[PDB]
Design a binder for this molecule. Structure first.
Ligand code: NAD
Ligand code: NAD
Lengths: 317, 317
């Protein structure tokens, strides 16, 4: 008995609304846009419902403040967060967003415990870890969106240098979504050609690569300082939809994201950004990148950042 | 010589950003987001650029505040407007927006006078007329977006009543984008079946049709009262992309928009909501709907309100 796919978006602010809009435009699923703020999800859903006939989609998009409406959701995307952009570090939202997730975790557990959950709420790696702990869902059914956005940014910057289509740049960012993220230049390729080759050829300099690595690392502040009123939300929404697609269409897509890693990268059971294979059973596998010693070390420092914020959360007021 | 298609969005608020996002996602053209507000267009353009590789698009999107950047634009879409949502009417903002439009007209006149210009700035029909006058562009290359958004709502509401895909509802809303808009119920068909027939089959009462007509004219308020921030912006951005598409792909598509009508509907040269044929030469034709005496009267009232407010603006100091 064919049933329409259903995605619940918890939090209907900037990112949440664009997720709804893109999912409906692609006719990927019906969408349930959930928020505790009166009127916001309802009006965004009505406005998006009107664009449906324009896109040729028959997806249904409704607004709600009732967890009961997310029952049967195949995928839950969590964007809910306290207000205001982080001033210097995504960690500043730690205390407030962990409380919100406790609440979202109760709604999920009761209305759609078999859903694939994708967290977006910052500080990402720690929020995903917190969510999985308080909700009790299987590790492979809970992951965080970050890698796809960090890697799209790294691929884009590399592509803008060489003047080529970014889809032809292969490049991963691993580790937690924060200042210590590791854009792995060691395995970047452009049409099959490694960066070491472009250096010999004289078409890119190590300094140029270094600037790309840095740009990647603090790209969030560049966008946030220009928007003034908030942080990025167009690409983070497209990234969440790519992850939801991988699950709903059982793609076996290789997706860098925050996933529970306990056997690769020399860690034994932590959520962090790694290349995963996503399909109908959620995170189905993690791939082992070939890191240089210097990279294995920068990863090591990333992991410590994650552990530190995490201990801080464990000792919250 | 193949050149990339180029679309300038004048005004990067709620609607402009969404238009950039969609156009980019569909790889329909490169996008220039123009705003005089500091940082907004650069920030949205940068965030959207990061999402191009996720959508598999090579569209380039940049933000600027220099009209010289819109030169060579094949289409210009105008969303520039002074702050604050309409209270009861999209009219109140008349002078400020006409002032704003004067700048854009000089901008377009200098940098890309061969562009197809689509206005969205309210009060729509007057704004469009004003833009064409002061810019001097061919009448058939200047029009306003309203009908697509109104007809989409009208189709959506008819489709919800019958429980069928809105894409299979054929329906037009003509006249001014105001309370004086005319949802032409006599032009309604659902898979070939007319409302009279559904009437006789007892599948819809006249009361229900009336309520649908009313829902259409006041639908914008319903969205605005829920957003508590401004007016609808997801569906109006999509409607403008559909208009840009008919132009760029030379579709010869039926697009209900605000065009220079001068030998149909009993008017001799005014800008109003009518069913046009858009292709690579802009508005290439206007179709003549089979209106009932009542609708002819209703359109009548609508037509006066345009000229009325149009004179209020022809004077001023
Ligand atoms: N993972 C990443 O790559 C990434 C990238 C960009 C932004 N973000 C983060 O995603 C989050 C959302 O960003 P945004 O711009 O959409 O924020 P926003 O402020 O625009 O939206 C957050 C929404 O959460 C709603 N909300 C609040 N408390 C809630 C609750 N208890 N239950 C349900 N909804 C609730 C709000 O009412 C609001 O509409 C932030 O934490 C931001 O830092 C993450
Ligand atoms: N035609 C319709 O169907 C329809 C439907 C919905 C909304 N609208 C109207 O569309 C317009 C835009 O709506 P919105 O929600 O995007 O508004 P918005 O306030 O979010 O954006 C308007 C943008 O105009 C910019 N701006 C101001 N002065 C400018 C100038 N001189 N040059 C360039 N940019 C300038 C602002 O800085 C802002 O970014 C309004 O007039 C709104 O009422 C029309």
């Amino acid at each position: 008995m064919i049933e329409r796919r259903k995605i619940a978006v918890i939090g209907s602010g900037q990112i949440g609304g664009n997720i709804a809009y893109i999912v409906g435009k692609d006719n990927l699923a019906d969408v349930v846009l959930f928020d505790i703020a009166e009127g916001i999800p309802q009006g965004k859903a009505l406005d998006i419902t009107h664009s449906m006939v324009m896109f040729g989609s028959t997806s249904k998009v409704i607004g709600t403040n009732d967890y009961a409406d997310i029952s049967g959701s195949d995928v839950v995307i969590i964007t809910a967060s306290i207000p205001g952009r982080p001033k210097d570090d995504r960690s500043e939202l730690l205390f407030g967003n962990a409380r919100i997730l406790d609440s979202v975790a109760e709604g999920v557990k009761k209305y759609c415990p078999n859903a694939f959950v994708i967290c977006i709420t910052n500080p990402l790696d720690v929020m995903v870890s917190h969510f999985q702990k308080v909700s009790g869902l299987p590790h492979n059914k809970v992951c965080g969106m970050a890698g796809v956005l960090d890697s799209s940014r790294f691929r884009t910057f590399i592509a803008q240098h060489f003047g080529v289509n970014a889809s032809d740049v292969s490049a991963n960012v691993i580790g937690g979504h924060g200042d210590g993220m590791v854009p792995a230049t060691s395995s970047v390729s452009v049409g099959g050609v490694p960066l070491s080759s472009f250096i010999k050829q004289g078409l890119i300099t190590q300094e140029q690569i270094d600037e790309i690595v840095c740009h990647t690392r603090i790209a969030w502040k560049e966008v946030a300082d220009n928007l003034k009123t908030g942080t990025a939300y167009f690409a983070p929404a497209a990234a969440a939809v790519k992850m939801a697609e991988a699950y709903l269409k059982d793609k076996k897509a290789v997706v860098p994201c925050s996933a529970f890693c306990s056997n690769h990268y020399g860690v034994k059971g932590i959520y962090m950004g790694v290349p995963t294979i996503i399909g109908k059973n959620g995170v189905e596998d993690i791939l082992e990148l070939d890191l240089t010693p210097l990279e294995q070390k920068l990863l090591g420092e990333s992991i410590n950042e994650v552990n530190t914020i995490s201990k801080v959360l464990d000792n919250a007021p």
